[PDB]
Amino acid sequence: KGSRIELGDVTPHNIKQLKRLNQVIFPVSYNDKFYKDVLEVGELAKLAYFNDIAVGAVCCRVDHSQNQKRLYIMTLGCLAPYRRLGIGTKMLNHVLNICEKDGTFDNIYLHVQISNESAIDFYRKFGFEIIETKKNYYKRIEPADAHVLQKNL
Numbered sequence: 313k314g315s316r317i318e319l320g321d322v323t324p325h326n327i328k329q330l331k332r333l334n335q336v337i338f339p340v341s342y343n344d345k346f347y348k349d350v351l352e353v354g355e356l357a358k359l360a361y362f363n364d365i366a367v368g369a370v371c372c373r374v375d376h377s378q379n380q381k382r383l384y385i386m387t388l389g390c391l392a393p394y395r396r397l398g399i400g401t402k403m404l405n406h407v408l409n410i411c412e413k414d415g416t417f418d419n420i421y422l423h424v425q426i427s428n429e430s431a432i433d434f435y436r437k438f439g440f441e442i443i444e445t446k447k448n449y450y451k452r453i454e455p456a457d458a459h460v461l462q463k464n465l
C-alpha cells in the first residue's frame with residue numbers, strides 16, 4: 313500500500329529497455345536467444361519500475377533437470393542507485409508467488425558469482441542455501457566461480 317515499486321510485463325515494445333538494464337547491471341552479456349526466450353516466458357520475466365522509471369528486471373525459465381521441475385532465475389537485478397529500496401525483494405517475491413500458486417516446482421535456484429557477497433546475503437535472507445560452488449562457471453570474467461543457491465519448495 314502506497315508502494316513506489318511496480319513490476320510490469322516485458323514486451324517487444326520495452327525489451328530494449330530490459331537489454332539495456334542487463335547490460336549496465338551484469339558483468340556478462342546475454343545473447344539474442346536469451347531475449348527472444350524472455351518474450352515467451354510470460355510472468356517469469358518482469359521489469360521493475362521505481363516511480364514509473366525502469367530500474368531493474370528479473371528473467372527466469374522453467375528447468376527440467378535432476379528429475380525435478382525447477383525454477384531457474386537467470387537474472388535478477390536493480391541499478392546501483394536504486395538498491396536497498398526493496399526492488400530486489402519485490403522481484404523475488406513475484407517469482408516465489410508464481411511457484412506457490414503453481415505448486416508443481418520442487419525448488420528454485422540460480423548462480424551467484426562468489427565475489428557477490430551482497431547477492432548471497434540477499435538470497436540467504438529468503439531461505440536460499442549455498443548447495444554447491446561451481447568452479448569455472450564463467451569463462452571471460454573473474455572470479456570464474458559461482459555458488460549455486462537453492463530454495464526448496
Ligand SMILES: CC(C)(COP(=O)(O)OP(=O)(O)OC[C@H]1O[C@@H](n2cnc3c(N)ncnc32)[C@H](O)[C@@H]1OP(=O)(O)O)[C@@H](O)C(=O)NCCC(=O)NCCS
Binds near residue numbers: 386
Ligand atoms: C542482489 C540485488 C538484486 C538485491 O536487490 P535490492 O533491490 O538492493 O534488494 P532489497 O532492497 O530488496 O534488499 C533486501 C534485503 O537483502 C539484504 N541485502 C541486500 N543487499 C545487501 C547488502 N549490500 N548488504 C547486506 N545485506 C543486503 C538485506 O537484508 C535487505 O533488506 P534491508 O534492505 O531491509 O536491510 C542487487 O544488489 C543487485 O541488483 N545486484 C546486482 C544483481 C546481482 O548481482 N544478482 C545476481 C544473481 S541473478
Ligand SMILES: CNC(=O)c1csc([C@@H]2C[C@H](NC(=O)[C@@H]3CC(=O)N(C)C(=O)N3)CN2C(=O)c2ccc(-c3nnn[nH]3)cc2)n1
Binds near residue numbers: 339428
Ligand atoms: C538454459 N539456460 C539458459 O537459457 C541460460 C541463458 S543465460 C543462463 C545463465 C544464467 C546465469 N546467470 C548468472 O550467472 C547470474 C547473473 C550474472 O550475470 N551473474 C554474474 C551472477 O552472479 N548470476 C548466467 N548464465 C550462463 O549460462 C552464462 C552466461 C554467461 C557466461 C559468461 N562467462 N564469461 N562470459 N560470459 C557464463 C554462463 N542460462
